[PDB]
């Protein structure tokens, strides 16, 4: 039914420009305005602007007047948001949202497009183990990769309970770091194989690290 | 130029009780306000509009009162799927809309003291120029926890990073990790590496430490 489908995630070097699509399905594209808002994990939602699909007329938020350009294609029924002069605080999730008179409240929203602003280059994560000495806690420091995301599964999906995978942190290098840690009965090491399988699809990386101790 | 300010930034309440958030406007927006719920990794979904009118599919425990400058969303009888983030939004003058900062709703549970662990740098990472000591705070509640690093009793400042996970699904607790990164030269120059955890579920701080070797 009512569906907005935007483009995939994108990585930008600072000062470039990014163009996010948003395809509608399940309603009359020409009859309902399209809002663009954004969400950075340092604040809440930031409205970017409003476009009328039938006309193409726009009005942008005061914060973005100039850098943002909203357009549309009636044939393929797609709205486009283009943000330019990308500074490092423009990395965020970008949402298009359909407006259902003077009733402006947005529904439904798109899947969101993650746009990262950084000059770091694609890089595989280096995996290091977190071995336990004296229940027991074992872990996996996946370190210095770009860009996000990474997938961590223990034991090729065997061990799942007690597993805690931490959100990634952006280091001063511009690369990300995250750890995954699972608690296991202490007697099980010395008997059971506990492998940390990480994969990074951006940068052709498939690493397996046996996490054993002492 | 109309600003919406969200009630408290975070709220923890036990499942099944009552939850009250309050959106505030600098300018009187008359009625003219919507609410959104958003789960992590997902887009916001519409909840109420016109301050009080539930959206299609919005269950009856969600209600909202308003008119003027100060508004309120209320969830009677919390539920598992309601713990999320909630945003208010204004449309006082037609095309211009501004959102709130947000209020994250959390599950209130019993106090749980963290199980602490410390991990030295792995002998594969020292071959480069870095060393990482990792302190884990497993399955604790509430969120508030103060971890400090000390090397040779020298209290570290601005060289660790903290990351906290989302509230566990089966236990409703949190886990936290403090990663201290040093140069290998700085690492092998010191012996005792200690991570001290302060938490309201702890009679006294829990210090977990190790020696280089």
Residue numbers in the entry:
A (entry chain H): 1 to 52, 52A, 53 to 82, 82A, 82B, 82C, 83 to 96, 100, ...
B (entry chain L): 1 to 95, 95A, 96 to 212
What does the publication say?
The HIV-1 envelope glycoprotein trimer (Env), a gp41-gp120 heterodimer, is the only universally exposed viral protein on the surface of HIV-1 and, therefore, the lone target available for recognition by the immune system. Env changes conformation to facilitate viral entry upon binding to CD4 on target T cells. This leads to the exposure of highly conserved CD4-inducible (CD4i) epitopes within constant region 1 and 2 (C1/C2) of gp120, known as the cluster A region, which contains non-neutralizing (as assessed using assays measuring direct neutralization) but potent ADCC epitope targets for antibodies (1–5). The prototype antibodies for this region include A32 and C11 (14, 15), mAbs that recognize distinct non-overlapping epitopes.
CH55 Fab crystallized as Fab alone, space group P1 with a = 74.0 Å, b = 74.0 Å, c = 75.9 Å, α = 106.8°, β = 108.4°, and γ = 91.8°, and in complex with gp12093TH057 coree in space group P6122 with a = 90.6 Å, b = 90.6 Å, c = 409.0 Å, and γ = 120.0°. Crystals diffracted to 2.46 Å and 3.8 Å with 3 Fabs or 1 complex in the asymmetric unit, respectively. Interestingly, we found much of the CDR H3 disordered in the unbound CH55 Fab structure even given its modest length of 13 amino acids, implying that its structure rearranges upon binding to gp120. The constant part of the CH55 Fab accounts for much of the difference between the bound and unbound structures, with an average main chain RMSD of 2.48 Å for the full Fab and 1.06 Å for the variable part. Aside from the CDR H3, which is only ordered in the complex structure, the CDRs are largely superimposable for both the bound and unbound structures. However, CDR H3 undergoes a significant rearrangement upon binding to gp120.
